[PDB]
Symmetry: C11
């Protein structure tokens, strides 16, 4: 199973997990402050991940950046 | 299992999941504001994903860009 | 399972899924307008995909471009 | 499971499925007009595919071109 | 399974499937006219394929050409 | 056979925080690393996301990244 | 399952299947004339193949040539 | 299943296996003297490995060095 | 399952199969004359292959030559 | 189907030591190689770590490393 | 399963199979004379292989030579 790496480039970045299945909703929001790194899988409970806030992101398709608010 | 990355290049980008199965219609729409990123899999319930609005998209087959 | 990326290059492009099985017919036609991208898998119900209209297409075998009537 | 990409280079190109099984006969012929693209898998029902008419073809082994 | 691409370079090219199993015989002969392309798998019924006539062939192992 | 991440502490007191797999998300363990130590940590039945706090050099299958304290 | 491609470079080339199992013997010999191609899998019944006569051979390990 | 190579660059390098499971603690410490190499897998009992001391380390993600 | 290609460079080459299992002995020796090629898998009955005589060999690990 | 390590002894008395798989970790076998002998050894149901003592040239899937006596 | 290629560069080379399991002992030694090649797998019965005498060895991790 795949994972994404998220490094917060400012305070208060959210890494948000969306529910797997017929229902889609946020089930968790992980707050990152500046310089922290989260490495998060897709899972039986999370089939999509949203990042909000300025962050440097790595996936198997390469580098992407989210831009803040 | 495959996934796509969608980065919104303007407010109100719409990432649209189409139902897997004999029937096709959309079952969820996730809107992204400018600069937000969605990383979304193909799943038991989603077998096609449509993007409306200006977005920078990555998949296993490279970069593509939707325009609004 | 494989997927194809289709970006409409004009209004009214149709991505048509053909039924899997002994029977071959169109079960769904997804209409795309200029600029929209559809990323569609092959599935239990769709074993061939036809694209009518001007579009830019990526698959595992590379880029190809459909041209409209 | 693999697939083949067929772009028609003139009107009336035929993409023909041959039946999987002890028996080999046609089963379906999909007509493509000029510029249309069909992306077709090998399947439980189809184990060989013939292209007749002028088309640009991509498979995992590269590009090939049929001639009418 | 693996598949082979065969493009007929002259009329009346034969792509022949040999039966899988203890016994080996021809079960099917597919005639290609000049310019036609056959994309053909190995299958439950076919474990060897013979090409007779001038054709351009692609397999996972690269290009080879049969001659009349 | 899961993926793993390599974390090298670049200062004392780095925290490698495992987050619970499953419907609920919480920290189940924080492994504290001192400067120069290396932890090689898999994703597992119990850990589906890993958070790093403090200064560290990190390797994953998508490349190098650095967390900052 | 792997396969070998054999192009006959002269008449009467023999592609010989050896039986899988405790016993080893030839169960089939396919004769190729000049310019014919045979693409042949390893199978439940065939676990070694022998080529006799002048031919051009491709496998996963590259090209090799048998001589008469 | 993955493995880590550890080469001790001084005496008393400690390779520490952490328990797989809901609980985390060390269940084994294997000390290495200078110049000894340990090639250790992840296992049913070890899902994280800590190295203390000066060591040269290879994993599938490249080389890394611990400092003691 | 993997295979070996053997091309005989002289008459009389032997490609010998060794039994899988607790015991090890030769169960078959295939003779190759000059220029003949054998392509031979590992199998349920053969877990090691010995080549005697001069031949050009290819495996997944590249070319080697017996003498 | 498991991974394996190649060990070439560069002096006499090199020991390739197998550590037990499971909850118990101990040495269960020590293979003595003299100069120039090679051992190609798999990870196994019984051996989940391998220790080399003495001067040896080692190849893994991660590359070459050398042990020093 | 992986395999190793051993080419003996002098007479009397020994390729030694070590038992799989909790017990480790030699179960077989195959003697190779100069210029003989043995291609040997890992198996249910053989989880380590030792070579004694001068030989050129190939494995998935490259070339290594043993010296007598
Ligand atoms: N308990 C969550 C943890 C998690 C994994 N990846 C995530 C991405 C975003 C938010 C939460 C997560 C899960 O197993 O699914
Ligand atoms: N609940 C949806 C979440 C999802 C995944 N990928 C998507 C793409 C578009 C819209 C929703 C989604 C699912 O598991 O299928
Ligand atoms: N319900 C359809 C959705 C779909 C996937 N790929 C397609 C290609 C074309 C048309 C529709 C589709 C299916 O699961 O098959
Ligand atoms: N119903 C057909 C659809 C199809 C797929 N590939 C084809 C190639 C040619 C013609 C038809 C097809 C099948 O599943 O087999
Ligand atoms: N009905 C045949 C179709 C076929 C596939 N590959 C072929 C090659 C040659 C001749 C026939 C075929 C089969 O399933 O085996
Ligand atoms: N007992 C934990 C060990 C672990 C693995 N990776 C981790 C990452 C962070 C914290 C603990 C861990 C587990 O099996 O999941
Ligand atoms: N009936 C034979 C056909 C065959 C496949 N590969 C071959 C190689 C040589 C001779 C015959 C064959 C089989 O399934 O095994
Ligand atoms: N009947 C033998 C044929 C064989 C395959 N590879 C070999 C190598 C050497 C000798 C015989 C063979 C088997 O299936 O094992
Ligand atoms: N008996 C332990 C041995 C082990 C493997 N890798 C390790 C890393 C560190 C310490 C011990 C180990 C196990 O099977 O898990
Ligand atoms: N009968 C032995 C044959 C063997 C395979 N590989 C070897 C390596 C060395 C010595 C003997 C062997 C086995 O199946 O295990
Ligand atoms: N009987 C041991 C043999 C072995 C394989 N690899 C080893 C490495 C070191 C020592 C012994 C071994 C086992 O099957 O596990």
């Amino acid at each position: 199973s795949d994972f994404v790496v998220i490094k917060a480039l400012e305070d208060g970045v959210n890494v948000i997990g969306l529910t797997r299945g017929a229902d889609t909703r946020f089930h968790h929001s992980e707050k990152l402050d500046k310089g922290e790194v989260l490495i998060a899988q897709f899972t039986e409970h999370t089939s999509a991940i949203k990042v909000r806030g300025k962050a440097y992101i790595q996936t198997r398709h390469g580098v992407i950046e989210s831009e803040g608010k």
